[PDB]
Amino acid sequence: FPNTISIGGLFMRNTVQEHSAFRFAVQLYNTNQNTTEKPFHLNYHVDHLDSSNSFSVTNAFCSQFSRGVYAIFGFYDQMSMNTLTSFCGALHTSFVTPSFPTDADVQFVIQMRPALKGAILSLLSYYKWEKFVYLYDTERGFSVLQAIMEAAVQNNWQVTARSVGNIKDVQEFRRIIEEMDRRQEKRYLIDCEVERINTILEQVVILGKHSRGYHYMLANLGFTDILLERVMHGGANITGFQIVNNENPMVQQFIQRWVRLDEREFPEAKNAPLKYTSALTHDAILVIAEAFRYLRRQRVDVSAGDCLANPAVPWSQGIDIERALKMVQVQGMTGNIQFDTYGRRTNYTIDVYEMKGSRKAGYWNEYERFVPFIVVTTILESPYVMYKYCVDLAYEIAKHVGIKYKLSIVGDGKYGAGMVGELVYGRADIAVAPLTITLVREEVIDFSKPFMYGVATPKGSALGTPVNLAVLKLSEQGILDKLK
């Protein structure tokens, strides 16, 4: 058993943050003082890939294999998954990847990104969803799509599935959402790359469908990276997913060190959010270290030939070393880590963050399935308000937003100068009434879209966006026109 272990690193484009994380994690392992914790020195041979020129990928992997490595940690996408995975399988070299898990079953490759199939199916069943839309792409394998279609067949769901991977025009998304609108479909299940998720959310916000009664389910790890700033204020149910839990000791212990790292040495270290891929990279370092520590615990021999063998001369000990990376049980940043005989992660935990501010909504496990945890002002001005239109509009807005409203006549009995004064000074919350729009009033309070005028809300009030969306919906439904 050698006293120094060298492993290779393959990083595709736009992987700077996890490159820094990989370097930081290997440094953390190396700087350990305990002999048992650091039984040997660890070296990392980093490289880069293009994922488009297969010759470049083959040359990089060939250099890594020839120069001599014991394990290869790296990423891959749909373009270069087959090449690297097949070479690793043929060469009997363990390949640790935090990339998307391979839909097909391939040996000698370990993939640490937990599958969303179980959690997504359990949550979908838990919400009593029966008819919905399924927007997807195909850059993370076909596991999710196949599972969703099979579940729909078994449970007689009404799943309208659309692929948006090939879409390059936003107007395509706009037409798709308008079509699902005319079909009245309200529940969406989006599982795409963060970029396409952001584009779809931007398009739907522009069209104005982020209101109560519309659900969303971003079935994609990396809830933080999603630009959901606008949609939150729309008051539309959103269900996300995340693996790392902040409050556990491990994440805090890591991040405390991480925030203080050099910016030049570690790009996107201090000033970037910790993407879950970085967490999985840290877990990769932990699992490799534990596996090799276990190897040295026993007397297993570990010890590189031509790049392309005729027909094949895989060094035997590889089958042993791969087996070592299958029974590992170290509790890393993401939580429990355990690998099935094939390589896919098992016994994992998923945290289902639900929006409404972000708040946890239980958790999902392979064994336990899913376990969860106003004043209105009006002026007594006929015919808008008469002692027994504006009352009907207020009731319609409350219904469309679901808020409990209590009507009242402004004490001053006069317009702003006052009702607007009542809003500004902090009382009466919302206010719906005939208010002539003047540039001065925008300084103090925020209006809604004109409906003949506009509903009034205090500046910065959380109800401004919901009331604006409700007014827009009423205007486009023709009810506002019908009332007059």
Ligand X SMILES: CC(=O)N[C@@H]1[C@@H](O)[C@H](O)[C@@H](CO)O[C@H]1O
- List binding-site positions for L-glutamate: 434, 436, 441
Which helix H or strand E contains 190, and what residues bound it? strand 188-191
Judged by CB, which is closer to ligand X: 362, or 418?
362
Minimum gap (Å) between residue 278 Cβ and its own copies: 28
Instruction: Give the rounded distance of the alpha carbon of 82 from its chain centre.
Output: 25
438 binds, among its own copies, ligand X, none (CB under 5 to 8 A by kind): none
- When asked if residue 31 is in the footprint of ligand X (CB under 6 A), the reply is no
Minimum Å distance from CB 26 to ligand X?
19
Closest CA to 209 of 170, 243, 181: 181
The residue from 6, 160, 199, 346 that contacts ligand X (CB under 6 A) is 346
325, with CB counted inside 10 A (0-12, 13-18, 19+), is buried
Question: Residue 351 and residue 142: Cα distance in Å, rounded?
Answer: 23
Helix (H, G, I), strand (E, B) or coil at 238: strand
Q: How far is the CB of 107 from its own copies (least distance, A)?
A: 12
Judged by beta carbon, residue 86 or residue 252, the one nearer its own copies is: 86
Q: Is residue 280 within 8 Å of 38, Cβ to Cβ?
A: no
Smallest gap from Cβ 349 to ligand X, in A, equals 9
Of the candidate residues 198, 338, 358, 475, the single one contacting ligand X (CB under 6 A) = 338
* CA dist list (Å): 361 to 190, 347, 354, 401, 467: 19, 19, 6, 23, 27
**Lookup result for tokens 């272990």:** 5
Residue labelled with tokens 């809300």: 457
Partner from ligand X, its own copies, none binding residue 79, C-beta < 5-8 Å depending on class:
its own copies
Q: What is the largest CA-CA distance in the chain?
A: 95
Q: For ligand X, which is the closer residue by CB, 35 or 184? A: 35
Torsion (CA) 290, 291, 296, 297 in degrees, nearest 10 = 70
At closest approach, how far in Å is the CB of 35 from ligand X? 9
> Is there binding between residue 368 and ligand X (CB under 6 A)?
no
Report, in Å, the least distance between residue 106 CB and its own copies: 10
Q: How far, in Å, CA of 426 to CA of 21, rounded?
A: 48
Judged by CB under 6 A, which stretch of 34-42, 68-76, 184-192, 243-251 contacts ligand X? 34-42
**Least Cβ distance, residue 119 to ligand X (angstroms):** 16
58 touches, from its own copies, ligand X, none (C-beta below 5 to 8 Å by class): its own copies
Q: What are the CA-CA distances from residue 383 to residues 367, 400, 408 (Å)?
A: 63, 23, 16
Query: CA-CA distances (angstroms) from residue 394 to 4, 40, 96, 434, 484?
Result: 74, 72, 59, 12, 14
Residue 124 to residue 339: CA distance in whole angstroms: 26
Residue numbers of the site for its own copies (CB under 8 A)? 52-56, 58-59, 62-63, 79-80, 82-83, 86-87, 89-91, 138, 142, 145-146, 149, 153, 162-163, 166, 168-169, 307-308, 310-312
Residue 198 contact, options ligand X, its own copies, none, Cβ 5-8 Å cut-off depending on partner type:
none
Structure tokens at 303: 């010890």
Residue 34 in contact with ligand X, rule: CB under 6 A: yes
- Judged by beta carbon distances under 5 to 8 A according to partner kind, the member of ligand X, its own copies, none in contact with residue 36 is ligand X
Helix locations, 92-133, DSSP H: 117-126
**At closest approach, how far in Å is the CB of 34 from ligand X?**
5
Would you say 346 or 461 has its CB closer to ligand X? 346
| Residue from 36, 166, 171, 382 in contact with ligand X (CB under 6 A) | 36
Decide whether 73 or 87 has the Cβ nearer to its own copies: 87
Report the C-alpha gap between 216 and 180 in whole angstroms: 14
Of the residues 83, 347, 358, 461, which one makes contact with ligand X according to CB under 6 A = 347
CA 114 to each of CA 111, 210, 299: distance values in angstroms, whole numbers, following the listed order: 8, 30, 32
Residue 37 near which of ligand X, its own copies, none (CB within 5-8 Å, type-dependent)? ligand X
Task: Give the residue ranges of DSSP H helices in 70-116.
Answer: 81-91
Count residues near ligand X (CB under 6 A): 7
Torsion over CA: 457, 462, 463, 467 (sign): positive
* Choice between 160 and 346, CB closer to ligand X: 346
Residues forming the site for ligand X (CB under 6 A)? 34, 36-37, 336, 338, 346-347
